[PDB]
Amino acid sequence: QIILEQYDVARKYREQTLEQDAEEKIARNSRLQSEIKQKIDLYQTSIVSINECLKAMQIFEQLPVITES
């Protein structure tokens, strides 16, 4: 009942280092989120060409990737 009683003071002590973790973590999240975004663009271009060429003789087409939201 006293260890948790001083939750307030520990926050001020921790406040010094919390800024770096927040910005650093999102930067990692953005880097991977942007990195994967690059791969799908390469995938999207190739598949569109594949269907375009095969469209000349057959209607068996693959899936696009758009409005993922």
Partner 1 sequence: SKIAPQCQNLREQVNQLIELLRQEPTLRSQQDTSIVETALGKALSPRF
Partner 2 sequence: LTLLNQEMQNLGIEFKKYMSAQINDVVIGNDREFDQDFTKLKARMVARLDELLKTFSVMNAYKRATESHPRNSTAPFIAVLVEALYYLANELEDAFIEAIHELVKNFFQRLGDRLRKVDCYHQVYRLVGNDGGIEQLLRRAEEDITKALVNEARTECDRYVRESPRFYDEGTFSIYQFRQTLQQTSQGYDAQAIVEAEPAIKELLKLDFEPKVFNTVRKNFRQTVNNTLKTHLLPMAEEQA
Partner 3 sequence: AEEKYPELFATLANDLQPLCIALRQFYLENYRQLDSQPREIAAMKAQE
Name the residues that contact partner 3, by CB under 8 A.
Answer: 18-19, 21-23, 25-26, 29-30, 32-33, 36-37, 39-40, 43, 47, 54, 57-58, 60-63, 65, 68
- Dist CA 13 CA 3 (whole Å): 15
Q: Quick check: helix, strand or coil at residue 50?
A: helix
15's tokens = 């406040």
Amino acid at 65: V
**Positions in the binding site for partner 2 (CB under 8 A):** 1, 4-5, 7-8
**Positions in the binding site for partner 1 (CB under 8 A):** 39, 42-43, 46-47, 49-50, 52-54, 56-57
